[PDB]
């Protein structure tokens, strides 16, 4: 069951964990082998997993798809995520999700090591990402909704980088560092 849960968390929805385009990742049904309270807790973790899946979908939407060659590259950034800043945003998001992927693999290995471990151990171990991911998802959704383009995206990230969540602060600092690297590269080219 843990392997299936991780696969859903790894982006492979199954018969237990159903993905809904509208609702995101959800537990598909009541399983006879789970206590309903255990089902409730698992779905509570599945909320974080759903956010992760939606983040991965966004990553594919903005970096995984070929940029339509609309002659005016400035407007490609509006409707579709496009622009070097958009690529930097996607790269930063993937870099921030890399530690989560590593933690998920470590959890899988640990659960493989000890058959007496329960899902509660994962819920403990994964709670840090259950707190981290929602804020970054909100920031990304704001970027998408405001159609931030070019360096104006950098300004928005800076404004969001001043958040109060220390882990969110560090993650946004990493993203801002990548964006500033892109900005500095452009500035280098100009100067």
């Amino acid at each position: 069951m843990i392997h299936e849960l991780l696969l859903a968390l790894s982006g492979y929805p199954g018969s237990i964990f159903t993905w809904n385009k509208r609702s995101g990742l959800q537990v598909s049904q009541d399983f006879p082998f789970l206590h309903p309270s255990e089902t409730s807790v698992l779905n509570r973790l599945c909320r974080l997993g759903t956010d992760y899946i939606r983040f991965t979908e966004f990553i594919e939407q903005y970096t995984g798809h070929v940029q339509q060659q609309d002659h005016h590259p400035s407007q490609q950034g509006q409707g579709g995520l496009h622009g070097i800043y958009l690529r930097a945003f996607c790269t930063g998001l993937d870099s921030v999700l890399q530690p989560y992927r590593q933690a998920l693999l470590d959890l899988e290995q640990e659960f493989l090591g000890d058959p007496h471990l329960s899902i509660s151990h994962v819920n403990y171990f994964l709670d840090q990402f259950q707190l981290l991911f929602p804020s970054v998802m909100v920031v990304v959704e704001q970027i998408k909704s405001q159609k931030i383009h070019g360096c104006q995206i950098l300004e928005t990230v800076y404004k969001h980088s001043c958040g109060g969540l220390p882990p969110v602060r560090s993650a946004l600092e990493k993203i801002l560092a990548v964006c500033h690297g892109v900005m500095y590269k452009q500035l280098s080219a100009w100067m």
Binding site: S37, S120, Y124, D127, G163, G164
Partner: protein
């Protein structure tokens, strides 16, 4: 009603989740044990004692989740929420250990009346 079912309910309450036989009574703003006759009055009182802690846990977690999203709470508010989340993580770690111990006890299939049984 077996004690093990009460253990499961208590683990859910520690997670703020209603058990099969213990449910949150919103009218009493407390988790209530379902009125199934087979609960000992002593067992009922013990369940109530644990359910007060579960109610407090769920209330705290609800507050943290409700306020963590409010950017207007400012940096200090976010820091308070973060500290609360860290303490909640420690609590959840302890709860996970207890749950894993109960699961191991179920998994071994042996009724070891050893002092390690979750009483």
């Amino acid at each position: 009603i077996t004690e093990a079912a009460l253990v499961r309910d208590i683990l859910y309450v520690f997670q703020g989740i209603d058990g099969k036989n213990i449910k949150m009574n919103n009218t009493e703003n407390c988790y209530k044990v379902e009125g199934k006759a087979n609960l000992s009055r002593s067992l009922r009182d013990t369940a109530v004692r644990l359910s007060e802690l579960g109610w407090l846990h769920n209330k705290i977690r609800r507050y943290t989740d409700q306020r963590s999203l409010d950017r207007s709470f400012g940096l200090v508010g976010q820091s308070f929420c973060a500290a609360l989340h860290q303490e909640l993580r420690e609590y959840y770690r302890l709860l996970s250990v207890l749950h894993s111990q109960l699961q191991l006890e179920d998994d071994q299939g042996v009724n070891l009346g050893l002092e390690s049984s979750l009483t």
